[PDB]
């Protein structure tokens, strides 16, 4: 809609103010910020870096709507059957008495 202006360094709230799934991950819990997805989302929104949430989604949709959708449909592996036809590992070997051609030299 309207033009977007990146926030200044002084307009960005501190990391400690961000909230996670349950509560802020302040001192003694900072390393949990890496694992909390909601805390990261809230931090990105606070830092005006909302694209980090939106860009991966849309692209993913495109990737499914364009290339992976048909790949799955035409080449995807369906559910296995109850009675499975495993490989006996007997096919392929040359017969006894066969004289293979020499390798290049």
């Amino acid at each position: 809609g309207e033009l977007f202006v990146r926030p200044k360094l002084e307009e960005i709230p501190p990391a400690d103010q961000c909230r996670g799934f349950f509560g802020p991950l302040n001192d003694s819990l900072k390393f949990l910020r890496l694992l909390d997805i909601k805390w990261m989302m809230n931090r990105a929104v606070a830092m005006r870096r909302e694209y980090l949430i939106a860009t991966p989604t849309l692209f993913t949709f495109i990737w499914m709507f364009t290339w992976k959708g048909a790949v799955i449909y035409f080449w995807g592996d369906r559910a296995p059957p109850r009675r499975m036809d495993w490989n006996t590992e007997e096919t392929g070997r040359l017969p006894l008495g066969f004289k293979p051609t020499p390798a290049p030299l």
Partner: protein, 168 residues
């Protein structure tokens, strides 16, 4: 030497006669896939390193400067370390076609060379195989033509319940 032109026929024939694919050939192809992924990873690492080296000083300051998304403390330390390491010495920071060439040509050369030599390696591996696929590869390199229906001509091994066709 151009191994791809010879190997394309062999790959198509194997796909057509994949039934006689021994576990050894399957392992060979899995190793080829793994080496392709490894080559992609190393080429991407080289491209990222070249991009970072040629990046502008202000661009590096913006990327590896405040604010910190997590602000844990390790993030800031690592960013400051990398920024100091990059900005200490003088770096050739071209723009436009020059950066494109510098970042891409080495990456393309590395990836292509690795893939070509891995293709040669796979050709050698299939040559050393003692299966019907190896015999087909050797015959292809000898006569220059792909001999289809070879497995049934030389009576390659079949499951005990499917040997009736060979009964002649």
């Amino acid at each position: 030497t151009k191994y791809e032109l010879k190997m394309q026929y062999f790959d198509e024939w194997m796909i057509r006669w994949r039934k006689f694919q021994t576990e050894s050939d399957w392992e060979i192809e899995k190793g080829r896939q793994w080496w392709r992924r490894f080559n992609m990873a190393v080429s991407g690492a080289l491209f990222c390193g070249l991009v970072l080296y040629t990046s502008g000083t202000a661009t590096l300051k913006r990327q590896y400067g405040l604010p910190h998304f997590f602000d844990i403390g390790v993030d800031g330390q690592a960013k400051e370390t990398m920024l100091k390491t990059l900005t200490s010495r003088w770096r050739y920071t071209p723009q436009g076609y020059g950066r494109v060439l510098i970042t891409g040509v080495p990456t393309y050369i590395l990836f292509v060379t690795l893939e070509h030599y891995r293709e040669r390696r796979r050709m050698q591996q299939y040559l050393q195989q003692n299966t019907v696929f190896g015999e087909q590869m050797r015959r292809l390199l000898s006569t220059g033509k792909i001999e289809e229906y070879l497995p049934v001509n030389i009576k390659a091994t079949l499951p005990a319940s499917q040997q009736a066709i060979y009964n002649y």
